Design a protein around this ligand. Sequence first.
Ligand SMILES: NS(=O)(=O)c1ccc(Nc2cc(OCC3CCCCC3)nc3ncnn23)cc1
Length: 292
Amino acid sequence: MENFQKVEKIGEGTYGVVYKARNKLTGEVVALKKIRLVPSTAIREISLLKELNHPNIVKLLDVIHTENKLYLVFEFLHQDLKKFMDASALTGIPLPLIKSYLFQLLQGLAFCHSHRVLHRDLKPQNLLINTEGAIKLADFGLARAFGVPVRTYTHEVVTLWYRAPEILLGCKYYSTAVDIWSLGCIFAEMVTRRALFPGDSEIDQLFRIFRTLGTPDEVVWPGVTSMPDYKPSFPKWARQDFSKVVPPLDEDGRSLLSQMLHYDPNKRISAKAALAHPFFQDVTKPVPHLRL
Ligand SMILES: NS(=O)(=O)c1ccc(Nc2cc(OCC3CCCCC3)nc3ncnn23)cc1
């Protein structure tokens, strides 16, 4: 902590505050996260994260466990996907770049999934971009370490918008499919320039998903009716056309999203399978127009 000079606050997560900071010795510019809470298992989970290195995962440079406090020192990235979407709002992010970004996030996901590590809380604000055309996942594995509360330390309400329905229906065992779901939500938002399911309570979130995708039943999702928060009294809505949901996404794009948004997590496409989907046949890596 005293080895770093704070430059500016750049965010507030479910785990505490994030600063751009500079390392007083080496000169390195990092993202410094002080974790609010250190339990011996948090230490051990977090230390596993230090080995989980990939070009599409924000590098955890150091864990500083000092004075009974916990700091995470990350590779610094200058912008998030929310800010970039908002800045690209008038014409949309070009599809070639959407495709490149979706392709890289799926590589990062396939990587972490293959090491049995989930994100659990993907969202535009933890997807980070550079001037080189890269996109990276931030805070991977942190939710399994400190817990996703309803409010942050500053009382900010956590988004439900990207939450998978198995989580909303109270499944205690998350699988990697929850990340695919969130990433599918983000894909749709990139394309349409609107959030797919902007719920403002758990039942609002659920009911927005049902209105678009049809209330789930035993046909499409064996087991759904026996989940902890499933209620027979849930209204039964019919599905909508994806054609109606993400114009002007093309047929390959629509077919992948549909597989990323399958109700049953066991039918939901894997990151590795989605990488082989025809939508990526012509993937490229454009450089974005970034104002920093
Ligand atoms: N809003 S912004 O585009 O200017 C922006 C976004 C992000 C960052 N940098 C950043 C921010 C960050 O915080 C991530 C968020 C995730 C959602 C919850 C708040 C923290 N973690 C990070 N790790 C490396 N860089 N980095 C810098 C600027």
